[PDB]
Design an enzyme around this catalytic site. Structure first.
Site, PDB file in Angstrom:
ATOM      1  N   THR A   1       2.632  -7.246   1.975  1.00  0.00           N
ATOM      2  CA  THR A   1       4.058  -7.563   2.089  1.00  0.00           C
ATOM      3  C   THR A   1       4.502  -8.379   0.865  1.00  0.00           C
ATOM      4  O   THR A   1       3.682  -9.135   0.328  1.00  0.00           O
ATOM      5  CB  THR A   1       4.370  -8.278   3.413  1.00  0.00           C
ATOM      6  OG1 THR A   1       4.021  -7.325   4.410  1.00  0.00           O
ATOM      7  CG2 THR A   1       5.834  -8.654   3.562  1.00  0.00           C
ATOM      8  N   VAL A  30       5.317   0.117  12.908  1.00  0.00           N
ATOM      9  CA  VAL A  30       6.394  -0.484  12.087  1.00  0.00           C
ATOM     10  C   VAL A  30       6.422  -1.965  12.472  1.00  0.00           C
ATOM     11  O   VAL A  30       6.616  -2.220  13.685  1.00  0.00           O
ATOM     12  CB  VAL A  30       7.742   0.212  12.384  1.00  0.00           C
ATOM     13  CG1 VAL A  30       8.912  -0.482  11.708  1.00  0.00           C
ATOM     14  CG2 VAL A  30       7.718   1.688  12.007  1.00  0.00           C
ATOM     15  N   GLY A  31       6.148  -2.848  11.507  1.00  0.00           N
ATOM     16  CA  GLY A  31       6.217  -4.321  11.613  1.00  0.00           C
ATOM     17  C   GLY A  31       7.623  -4.782  11.265  1.00  0.00           C
ATOM     18  O   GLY A  31       8.523  -3.934  11.315  1.00  0.00           O
ATOM     19  N   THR A  54       2.794 -11.790  11.143  1.00  0.00           N
ATOM     20  CA  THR A  54       2.482 -10.898  12.324  1.00  0.00           C
ATOM     21  C   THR A  54       3.764 -10.142  12.714  1.00  0.00           C
ATOM     22  O   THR A  54       4.637 -10.784  13.273  1.00  0.00           O
ATOM     23  CB  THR A  54       1.839 -11.636  13.500  1.00  0.00           C
ATOM     24  OG1 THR A  54       0.929 -12.584  12.956  1.00  0.00           O
ATOM     25  CG2 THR A  54       1.133 -10.704  14.462  1.00  0.00           C
ATOM     26  N   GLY A  55       3.850  -8.838  12.381  1.00  0.00           N
ATOM     27  CA  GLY A  55       5.112  -8.074  12.576  1.00  0.00           C
ATOM     28  C   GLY A  55       5.603  -8.120  14.008  1.00  0.00           C
ATOM     29  O   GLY A  55       6.789  -8.491  14.225  1.00  0.00           O
TER      30      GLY A  55
END
Ligand code: NA
Ligand code: NA
Lengths: 135, 158, 150, 135
Positions: A1, A30-31, A54-55
């Site tokens: 990220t 998907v986060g 943490t998504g």
């Protein structure tokens, strides 16, 4: 990220975020990264935020909007809104990570509850600051 | 206020124990160059929006960071990338999730923002929109690095 | 203890309106009965949304609108205000009840959201049935597509 | 687009939202429906919300969470919050639609700014209310 936040000389705020996600991730998961208010938010009236961590948690907490709302509605300072979300609400949901934020007044915050966060910031016509570890 | 940029290249288990200074410096040098480029654009009167786009495009290009080139591998040894961008002025935004054929997903996300009535596009649907806007198609092999492949093996059994 | 439902917001004979009213009543009544019987808010919003998916009058599951390419792409999400857990799918075409798939994501995976074929594979690998996307197609919504293109 | 919100006898809130999107939509489009805090949000501390309408605008305004933050941080009644989001902030971004919301006290609000919202509600062991058009 990866992420960036900017205040410009016109006083405009913006935020952007991008990722390959987690090593070994399930295809199709998907986060928070591409989700407005979770991984990325900007509003000239509050704050620009880009999030990493943490998504699952950053989504459930709406991490990035929560900074905005805490400031806009709560009357928290950026320092106060950042501590609240990153050091308190996100840990109690099981979230680890951090975020970068700039408020409309040009205050900068780079909170994280993890060991490290690759990060840098600078005022225009000033020398930059870089960081990996705490302090 | 004073014009200002902040960037990051990810949070988590970074151990001082686990790195040399030479290793650390590769990340500091990368971060310094990208924030310095944004400070230069800001100083020249470029918009927050154009500044946060180029910064995230440089962090994508940088193979040290988990986005665009150097993206982590999926359990199927593929790459699936997501990005988002938001304009605090107009409150407009754009996002892509699950794209594998777009070199710079933050550019695809800017394209969704500026050239569609939508905030979010996913998968081949998002790819086909971007190709139609003249964005170039790539193989997801372009994102692969040994560092990230090594981490994949280290995480699993053969 | 209370339930609200909707079948969407937008731009008629009485008999026709009554079909919408009837559908909405039966579903709110079912949800009220479940609540009265002590069922969880979570189970109640799931079943309400499953019944709204099954009803061809509403744009979800059976009766889903058509894309520009005359296909169906469905999204759903569920959130439990108790644990603050959530689950969502986007862009699925072979799951009859996207709300049940969203529940499955909430319960059986570490992610909030899954999309497209990967959402579908996760579901099938956990016993959820594959359907032809044709089954969502209704005459009313097709004609609304042709109207829209005009 | 369809939705349900519920408060049970244990004081738990929950929300759920499902859709086909909008007729003629570009393939690979994603509106507010699958995005936590945009089309769907539940927190026992505040409110459960399911939204329907202009997906792009419900995302940009984080409608579902914005109701909760307005109540929690802003001190708005559920009624005031719903009026602000659906009547003022959604149209200010060029969006139409509405939402169903139940707060932890069991107030119900069903605001929309459109000609129509197919909607219905009832307290347990009470006769339901139904509605298509305004008022
Ligand atoms: Na990179
Ligand atoms: Na239906």
């Amino acid at each position: 990220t990866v992420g960036a936040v900017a205040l410009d000389l016109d006083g405009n705020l913006a935020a952007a975020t991008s990722t390959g996600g987690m090593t070994n991730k399930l295809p199709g998961c998907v986060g928070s990264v591409p989700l407005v208010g979770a991984g990325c938010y900007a509003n000239n009236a509050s704050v620009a935020v880009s999030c990493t961590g943490t998504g699952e948690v950053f989504i459930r907490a709406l991490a990035a909007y929560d900074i905005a709302a805490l400031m806009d509605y709560g009357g928290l300072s950026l320092a106060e809104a950042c501590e609240r979300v990153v050091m308190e609400k996100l840990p109690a949901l099981g979230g680890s990570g951090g975020l970068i934020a700039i408020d409309h007044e040009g205050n900068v915050a780079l909170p994280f509850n993890t060991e490290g966060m690759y990060r840098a910031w600078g005022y225009a016509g000033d020398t930059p600051t870089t960081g990996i570890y705490r302090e | 206020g004073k014009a200002v940029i902040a960037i990051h290249g990810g949070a988590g288990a970074i151990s001082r124990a686990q790195m040399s200074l030479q290793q650390e410096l590769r990340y500091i040098e990368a971060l310094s160059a990208i924030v310095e480029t944004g400070q230069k654009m800001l100083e020249a009167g470029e918009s927050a929006l154009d500044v946060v786009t180029e910064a995230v495009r440089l962090l994508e290009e940088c193979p040290l960071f988990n986005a665009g080139i150097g993206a982590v591998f999926t359990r199927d040894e593929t790459h699936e990338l997501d990005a988002c961008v938001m304009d605090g002025n107009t409150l407009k935004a754009g996002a892509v999730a699950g794209v594998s054929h777009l070199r710079n997903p933050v550019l695809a996300a800017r394209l969704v923002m500026e050239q569609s009535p939508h905030v979010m596009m996913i998968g081949e649907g998002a790819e086909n929109f971007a190709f139609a806007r003249g964005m170039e198609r790539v193989s997801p092999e372009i994102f692969s690095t040994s560092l990230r492949y090594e981490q994949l093996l280290a995480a699993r059994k053969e």
